[PDB]
Enzyme design. Sequence first.
Site, PDB file in Angstrom:
ATOM      1  N   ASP A 191      10.787  23.899 -41.949  1.00  0.00           N
ATOM      2  CA  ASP A 191      10.218  22.561 -41.665  1.00  0.00           C
ATOM      3  C   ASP A 191       8.705  22.663 -41.579  1.00  0.00           C
ATOM      4  OD1 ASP A 191      10.142  19.787 -40.903  1.00  0.00           O
ATOM      5  OD2 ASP A 191      11.113  20.191 -38.938  1.00  0.00           O
ATOM      6  N   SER A 192       8.013  21.522 -41.597  1.00  0.00           N
ATOM      7  CA  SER A 192       6.633  21.477 -41.124  1.00  0.00           C
ATOM      8  C   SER A 192       6.661  21.388 -39.565  1.00  0.00           C
ATOM      9  CB  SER A 192       5.869  20.396 -41.837  1.00  0.00           C
ATOM     10  OG  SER A 192       6.427  19.122 -41.604  1.00  0.00           O
TER      11      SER A 192
ATOM     12  N   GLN B  98       3.811  21.208 -35.698  1.00  0.00           N
ATOM     13  CA  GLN B  98       2.507  20.851 -35.097  1.00  0.00           C
ATOM     14  C   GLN B  98       1.414  21.587 -35.799  1.00  0.00           C
ATOM     15  OE1 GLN B  98       5.567  20.693 -32.945  1.00  0.00           O
ATOM     16  NE2 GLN B  98       4.813  18.644 -32.884  1.00  0.00           N
ATOM     17  N   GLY B  99       0.346  20.863 -36.094  1.00  0.00           N
ATOM     18  CA  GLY B  99      -0.823  21.442 -36.796  1.00  0.00           C
ATOM     19  C   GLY B  99      -0.756  21.278 -38.316  1.00  0.00           C
TER      20      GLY B  99
ATOM     21  N   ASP C 292       1.653   5.688 -40.817  1.00  0.00           N
ATOM     22  CA  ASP C 292       0.867   6.838 -40.332  1.00  0.00           C
ATOM     23  C   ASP C 292       0.051   7.444 -41.471  1.00  0.00           C
ATOM     24  OD1 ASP C 292      -0.161   8.804 -38.734  1.00  0.00           O
ATOM     25  OD2 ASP C 292       1.719  10.019 -38.625  1.00  0.00           O
TER      26      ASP C 292
ATOM     27  N   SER D  22       0.366  18.320 -39.409  1.00  0.00           N
ATOM     28  CA  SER D  22       0.215  16.874 -39.509  1.00  0.00           C
ATOM     29  C   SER D  22      -0.961  16.489 -40.364  1.00  0.00           C
ATOM     30  CB  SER D  22       0.044  16.288 -38.137  1.00  0.00           C
ATOM     31  OG  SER D  22       1.276  16.354 -37.401  1.00  0.00           O
ATOM     32  N   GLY D  23      -0.714  15.435 -41.157  1.00  0.00           N
ATOM     33  CA  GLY D  23      -1.753  14.955 -42.060  1.00  0.00           C
ATOM     34  C   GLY D  23      -1.790  15.620 -43.409  1.00  0.00           C
TER      35      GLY D  23
ATOM     36  N   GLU E 194     -15.302  28.141 -49.553  1.00  0.00           N
ATOM     37  CA  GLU E 194     -15.198  26.922 -48.749  1.00  0.00           C
ATOM     38  C   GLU E 194     -16.317  25.926 -49.111  1.00  0.00           C
ATOM     39  OE1 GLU E 194     -15.508  30.067 -47.465  1.00  0.00           O
ATOM     40  OE2 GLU E 194     -13.825  30.390 -46.087  1.00  0.00           O
TER      41      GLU E 194
ATOM     42  N   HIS F 105      -2.295   9.466 -37.066  1.00  0.00           N
ATOM     43  CA  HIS F 105      -2.234  10.101 -35.734  1.00  0.00           C
ATOM     44  C   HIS F 105      -3.154  11.309 -35.641  1.00  0.00           C
ATOM     45  CE1 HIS F 105       1.014  13.069 -37.021  1.00  0.00           C
ATOM     46  NE2 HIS F 105       0.467  13.741 -36.015  1.00  0.00           N
TER      47      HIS F 105
HETATM   48 CA   LIG Z   1     -12.075  30.347 -44.575  1.00  0.00          CA
END
Ligand SMILES: [Ca+2]
Length: 223
Positions: free
Chosen positions: A171-172, A174-175, A84, A177-178, A62, A40
């Site tokens: 909890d986890s 929105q954002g 999913d 996800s994945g 990074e 999703h």
């Molecule tokens: Ca950064």
Amino acid sequence: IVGGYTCGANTVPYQVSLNSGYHFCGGSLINSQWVVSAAHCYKSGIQVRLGEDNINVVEGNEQFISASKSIVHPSYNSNTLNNDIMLIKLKSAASLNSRVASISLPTSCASAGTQCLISGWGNTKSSGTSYPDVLKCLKAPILSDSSCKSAYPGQITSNMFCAGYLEGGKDSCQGDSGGPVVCSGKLQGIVSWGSGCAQKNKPGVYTKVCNYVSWIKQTIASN
Ligand SMILES: [Ca+2]
């Protein structure tokens, strides 16, 4: 992540942020070329960001690598979120180091009662909205199948498990996800769905990664 803690920079070195001009989902690095995320979270036009802590500051560790291919599971059902799971191939391999590292796929499926590490840059409020810049973490236990099905009657497949706290508060969200659910050092879950976040009797629902290992391995051997 609601009710979590600041992980600490690069202490979750397999966590990725998926960016399409902004962070929109997590993922997990499973080898130098491939990320696992939720189907999703599919978007066209994904840049994978590895080595992140604050997603709004370039801090120096990074690696930003465009996706070349994304592969949603062949049986993904976006209505029910069954299957999913998605694979994302990087255009070039990541340089693996102490801050950018892969997570193992599991051999066995994790057990009810196991405490897992869930992480992400998602919303930190059950009621309302606040998105952190730095990576948040949560330890949450896997709940029994029976408890999961009671919480979401008619909605849980054998490719899902619940984890969290039926009292609410952690909890986890929105954002997230994945992103990863790591148990015994291996990727056991993917942040998938839930009714709100951190609400009583409504734990998180996670894609059961151990059911997908043979698909993942044959797909990465072929792409
Ligand atoms: Ca950064």
